[PDB]
């Protein structure tokens, strides 16, 4: 299906050694920058507001931006609301 | 005799009159680290012996 | 966007060979060209050394 991929000589086929993927490698990103601050503020004095560096889960983010399109902004009624009413005083003629 | 200002009797409109030395301030958010120990990391490395 | 160091350890003991052939294996896989580079300013000094 692609003809980049077609193997007509035995030069490059070996073994298979590992195997990574796209949602793999994102949460593995996220963890080599937080835990080599999170060392190197651990080993020397600092001063600083501070903060604790962990990684969310990266699937549940993009699970749910995608859920955010499906809501509807607007809505269908069969009539407007009431935008107005009455009060009765003691007349007959003057509300 | 001591000519040091220690103790004068002031007027209440001169209690903020002693402001005239210029600090500086870090930020909050920026961090100060102290990397004297930094000058020492590092391997030693091993000569090829045979 | 990503770029790489050396991180020097000393709780690995390795042999003084695979530091010289690992010179000559940087000097091809990666890029420090005039547009962009993979290795930091840092380790290109290292990669010579070695």
């Known amino acids: 299906q692609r003809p980049e991929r077609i193997k007509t000589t035995p030069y490059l ?38 903060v604790d560096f962990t990684v969310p889960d990266v699937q549940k983010i993009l699970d749910d931006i995608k859920a955010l399109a499906a ?16 009060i009765v005083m003691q007349s007959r003629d003057r509300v | 005799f001591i000519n040091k200002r220690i103790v004068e009797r002031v007027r209440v409109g001169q209690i903020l009159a002693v402001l005239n030395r210029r600090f500086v ?20 490395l091993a000569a090829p012996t045979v | 966007q990503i770029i790489l160091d050396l991180k020097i350890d000393p709780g690995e003991r390795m042999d003084p060979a695979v530091r010289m052939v690992a010179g000559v294996v940087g000097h091809l896989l990666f890029t420090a060209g005039g547009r962009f580079t993979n290795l930091t300013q840092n380790m290109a000094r290292q990669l010579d050394i070695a």
């Open chain 1, 71 to 86: 809501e509807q902004v607007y809505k269908i009624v069969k009539v407007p609301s009431i935008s107005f009413r009455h």
């Open chain 1, 13 to 50: 086929e070996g073994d298979v050694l590992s195997s990574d993927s796209g949602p793999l490698l994102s949460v593995f990103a996220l963890q080599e920058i937080m835990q080599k601050v999170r060392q190197v503020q651990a080993d020397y004095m600092t001063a600083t507001r501070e």
């Open chain 2, 25 to 44: 301030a870090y930020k909050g958010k920026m961090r100060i680290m102290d990397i004297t120990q930094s000058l020492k990391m590092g391997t030693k």
